[PDB]
Amino acid sequence: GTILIDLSPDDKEFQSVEEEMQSTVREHRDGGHAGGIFNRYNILKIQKVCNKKLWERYTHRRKEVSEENHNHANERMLFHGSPFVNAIIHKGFDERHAYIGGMFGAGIYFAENSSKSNQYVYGIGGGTGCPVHKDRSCYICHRQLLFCRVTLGKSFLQFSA
Template sequence: MDYYHDRRVVQHAASQPWVRGFRLDEIDYKNETYQWIYDKMHNSISIHNGVKISKYHIVKIYQVKNSFLWSKYTARRSEIARDFPRGQLAPEIRLFHGTCHADVIVRNGFNVKYSNELSMFGKGIYFSDVSSKCNQYTFEAGGSGACKLHGNVHCTLCKRKMLVCKVTLGRNFRANMPMNGILRPPHGCHSVVAYPAQSFLKYPEYVIYNNYQAFPSYMIEYKISI
């Protein structure tokens, strides 16, 4: 799929109404956006370490309304757009971010200082279009963590949280090998993107290095079935 020209992405990308301050608005399950997120999650499930999720049981979906983060995001997006021909929009994409810190991020935004520069693509903020990839990071930072209550990586009883974020990729650098240790994208680029390749990467990864280059549009509370 050409994500930059996905009409559904464009439609929902324009759906963030202005609000002063911070608020989480629960989305009704009959709402078109709810169904769009439900489909986006279920259509991007893969096998991880021999285990495949059979279903996401969504508890609630919230639209995030945060005027401070939104203004910071749009300012960064405009800054990136200046590196493109006049009138051309900076490429954006809707991506998943799995984290045990979802509640903090929707209030205060992303913070790259908590990233590990020894990660595959350096000290950045990581996203994927594969929901089950991000699901692995919902119990513990760094992935492969178990729930605190049952000590189970594949726990079907504990609630998890995942974000759907609007990410301005801008001009991306296509990585074909690890880039451990970098603190910013290569010169002239705004992000690093890597696609699956034999003996390199199993699932796509999208990495930014600026706190305000992504906006957490939706927060999903859910459980899984295996």
């Protein structure tokens, strides 16, 4: 039930999504090991993901959370990078998309920094890099990130290195 709608670069919605991508790039403490060396991206395409069943599943849970947190879903827009982006856009997030060894336990992880989610596009730690060249810093191969609507509700604050 998923359809993908291309956004024009002239569309304000394309432009605001691109700006969030580009403006949340930072340097990483691995010197680019996982995600590559770069300060900015070449955006090739931005598509809106439209799936009624997945949307309704999201809004149902959002209302439950909201009602448990003084009518506040604490909804954010956050990046997610994964080898399974194609499964996610068709079937939704589930336990198969979790970072079992993540520092905050086995859950599904998102980042404010697009460059942080970029480190996971080819796997944990960048895996072996792109499938074609085995390069975590490949400048040729096309990468994909999701920019996601996320309900945080009441969020446990972990101060961490």
